[PDB]
Amino acid sequence: GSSGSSGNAPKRPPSGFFLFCSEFRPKIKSTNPGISIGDVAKKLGEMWNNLNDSEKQPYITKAAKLKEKYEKDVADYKSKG
């Protein structure tokens, strides 16, 4: 399955893995001639694992800030009290 988001409800925050994939996507698309989405995906997935626990460190912390901003929006959305 896929993890997306509806219209009303806010979109889910990216993951240290994605943030990097979206930042590295530009290169791949600039290095490979009209690379198919499927191709870029296969590359990213690998590039991620390749990285070290020290390389993702600065990539995971960034996602932490995106979660603090999401939760807030997620709460208001629902009518708890």
From Swiss-Prot:
It is found in: Nucleus; Chromosome; Cytoplasm. Residues 10-78 bind DNA. The modification Cysteine sulfonic acid (-SO3H) is found at C21. The modification Phosphoserine is found at S15. Expressed predominantly in placenta. The modification N6-acetyllysine is found at K29, K56. Multifunctional protein with various roles in different cellular compartments. May act in a redox sensitive manner. Associates with chromatin and binds DNA with a preference for non-canonical DNA structures such as single-stranded DNA. Can bend DNA and enhance DNA flexibility by looping thus providing a mechanism to promote activities on various gene promoters. Proposed to be involved in the innate immune response to nucleic acids by acting as a cytoplasmic promiscuous immunogenic DNA/RNA sensor. Negatively regulates B-cell and myeloid cell differentiation. It is linked to Microphthalmia, syndromic, 13: A form of microphthalmia, a disorder of eye formation, ranging from small size of a single eye to complete bilateral absence of ocular tissues (anophthalmia). In many cases, microphthalmia/anophthalmia occurs in association with syndromes that include non-ocular abnormalities. MCOPS13 patients exhibit colobomatous microphthalmia with microcephaly, short stature, and psychomotor retardation. Belongs to the HMGB family. This is High mobility group protein B3.
